[PDB]
Symmetry: D2
Subunit: 132 residues, 4 copies
Amino acid sequence: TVNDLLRTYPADLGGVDREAMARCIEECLRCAQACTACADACLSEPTVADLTKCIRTDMDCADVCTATAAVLSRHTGYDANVTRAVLQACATVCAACGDECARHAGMHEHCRVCAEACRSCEQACQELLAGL
Amino acid sequence: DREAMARCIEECLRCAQACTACADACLSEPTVADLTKCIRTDMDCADVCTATAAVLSRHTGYDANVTRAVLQACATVCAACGDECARHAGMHEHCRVCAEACRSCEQACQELLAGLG
Amino acid sequence: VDREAMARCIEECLRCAQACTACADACLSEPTVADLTKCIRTDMDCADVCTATAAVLSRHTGYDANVTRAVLQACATVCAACGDECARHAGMHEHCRVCAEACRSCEQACQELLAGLG
Amino acid sequence: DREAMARCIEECLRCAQACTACADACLSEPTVADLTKCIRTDMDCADVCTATAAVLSRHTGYDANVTRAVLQACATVCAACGDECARHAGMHEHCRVCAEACRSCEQACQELLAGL
Ligand SMILES: [Cu+2]
Ligand SMILES: [Cu+2]
Ligand SMILES: [Cu+2]
Ligand SMILES: [Cu+2]
Ligand SMILES: [Cu+2]
Ligand SMILES: [Cu+]
Ligand SMILES: [Cu+]
Ligand SMILES: [Cu+]
Ligand SMILES: [Cu+]
Ligand SMILES: [Cu+]
Ligand SMILES: [Cu+]
Ligand SMILES: [Cu+]
Ligand SMILES: [Cu+]
Ligand SMILES: [Cu+]
Ligand SMILES: [Cu+]
Ligand SMILES: [Cu+]
Ligand SMILES: [Cu+]
Ligand SMILES: [Cu+]
Ligand SMILES: [Cu+]
Ligand SMILES: [Cu+]
Ligand SMILES: [Cu+]
Ligand SMILES: [Cu+]
Ligand SMILES: [Cu+]
Ligand SMILES: [Cu+]
Ligand SMILES: [Cu+]
Ligand SMILES: [Cu+]
Ligand SMILES: [Cu+]
Ligand SMILES: [Cu+]
Ligand SMILES: [Cu+]
Ligand SMILES: [Cu+]
Ligand SMILES: [Cu+]
Ligand SMILES: [Cu+]
Ligand SMILES: [Cu+]
Ligand SMILES: [Cu+]
Ligand SMILES: [Cu+]
Ligand SMILES: [Cu+]
Ligand SMILES: [Cu+]
Ligand SMILES: [Cu+]
Ligand SMILES: [Cu+]
Ligand SMILES: [Cu+]
Ligand SMILES: [Cu+]
Ligand SMILES: [Cu+]
Ligand SMILES: [Cu+]
Ligand SMILES: [Cu+]
Ligand SMILES: [Cu+]
Ligand SMILES: [Cu+]
Ligand SMILES: [Cu+]
Ligand SMILES: [Cu+]
Ligand SMILES: [Cu+]
Ligand SMILES: [Cu+]
Ligand SMILES: [Cu+]
Ligand SMILES: [Cu+]
Ligand SMILES: [Cu+]
Ligand SMILES: [Cu+]
Ligand SMILES: [Cu+]
Ligand SMILES: [Cu+]
Ligand SMILES: [Cu+]
Ligand SMILES: [Cu+]
Ligand SMILES: [Cu+]
Ligand SMILES: [Cu+]
Ligand SMILES: [Cu+]
Ligand SMILES: [Cu+]
Ligand SMILES: [Cu+]
Ligand SMILES: [Cu+]
């Protein structure tokens, strides 16, 4: 669907890596879902009081990944400054979320899944950023 | 159900992205002046689906009234967006793709809504 | 006449979203966080729906009363639920008292607009 | 200083709403074909300001790198949106109002960023 809409856009996109752009959008949507699920699972743990930083960072990562996917999906009136700045924010938050979840991943499968999604999204954002 | 909940969350996030992409494609059409209702409805559908995905991710069974009310709003907006994009789908492949994403999301929301009661 | 009520509801929704996010964050920092998890979840839901609602209401191009009423109904429902949950903790936590007042005010502004359309 | 954080959150939510309204107003102009970059940038600014308001509401000082990165994105988008709307502000009152909201938000985000 993401690649579909990208191919039907009514103009040339410059020379942005189209396949990398589509991959990053897809990763951001998967990552947002993984983060929201991790936040919800942490909230239901009896040890929730020890997982508050994890929860907060999950929520931040979901919000930024959702914003990022939206900004990346838009090509009209493209502004490299905005796109680069949002990708950099997303990479930073995904790295932070990955770090926090990795600390709980031994104990909680939900944080293991979330950490993998965040690392993958971090890498897809960094790759797109380098390719612009 | 959990599996149906996760399917609906995924559909909502894809739908929001499809609507954003459709709005942007419409905005770049030379005939943009004829696509303004499509663009506005896409924007509404993106905002409601984004909210819906977030609300559903935190669903616990407790206060099903909230979940049902949000699902109903989402189904309604997806159907409206699907109807508008379907009008331009013969001419614009982006609206065809968007209409399909909205119908899929509409159906996933209706299915989940029926399964909560 | 719809427009002044629409603007009032948009303003209420933005105040409500901020109050809910602040309440969720304050609950998260309480030593008793384990007892406030439903409050936190509902605050987050109310912030998301109020932000969506304010955006839908701000748009007049290609207006469709059915969509607007459906979103307002969702918003009214979530504000009422959030108001109820925060009211349970309002005796103990000032943040939940403030949030409950914002949600009731937003609930009422959404119900008023809904009745006036439809 | 927590009051500054709350002020910035409020500004971000107002800015998102102002951008949404400007995008909608532009969409209804007969000259919409000339306003597409304004509309697109308004939509980006709404999404980023919405994200920013949420991130800031949960800020604890722990991982300041996240908050700073988000504020930097927000400042950049608000500046871009402010620039584009300022170009149409002579002709469209909606873009004048939106440009003022974006400049205020840009400045509040830059100020907060410097203070962390
Ligand atoms: Cu987890
Ligand atoms: Cu569509
Ligand atoms: Cu509200
Ligand atoms: Cu509360
Ligand atoms: Cu409310
Ligand atoms: Cu991501
Ligand atoms: Cu994530
Ligand atoms: Cu988690
Ligand atoms: Cu995350
Ligand atoms: Cu993320
Ligand atoms: Cu990210
Ligand atoms: Cu992440
Ligand atoms: Cu995570
Ligand atoms: Cu975790
Ligand atoms: Cu996690
Ligand atoms: Cu993650
Ligand atoms: Cu991520
Ligand atoms: Cu990413
Ligand atoms: Cu949807
Ligand atoms: Cu959609
Ligand atoms: Cu479209
Ligand atoms: Cu369209
Ligand atoms: Cu749509
Ligand atoms: Cu939607
Ligand atoms: Cu939905
Ligand atoms: Cu929907
Ligand atoms: Cu839709
Ligand atoms: Cu549509
Ligand atoms: Cu459409
Ligand atoms: Cu389209
Ligand atoms: Cu369309
Ligand atoms: Cu469409
Ligand atoms: Cu659609
Ligand atoms: Cu949809
Ligand atoms: Cu759906
Ligand atoms: Cu609220
Ligand atoms: Cu509460
Ligand atoms: Cu609330
Ligand atoms: Cu709310
Ligand atoms: Cu409301
Ligand atoms: Cu509400
Ligand atoms: Cu509270
Ligand atoms: Cu509370
Ligand atoms: Cu509340
Ligand atoms: Cu509320
Ligand atoms: Cu309201
Ligand atoms: Cu802002
Ligand atoms: Cu703005
Ligand atoms: Cu505008
Ligand atoms: Cu404009
Ligand atoms: Cu703007
Ligand atoms: Cu903005
Ligand atoms: Cu900002
Ligand atoms: Cu901003
Ligand atoms: Cu702006
Ligand atoms: Cu602007
Ligand atoms: Cu503008
Ligand atoms: Cu304007
Ligand atoms: Cu403008
Ligand atoms: Cu503008
Ligand atoms: Cu603007
Ligand atoms: Cu603006
Ligand atoms: Cu702004
Ligand atoms: Cu700002």
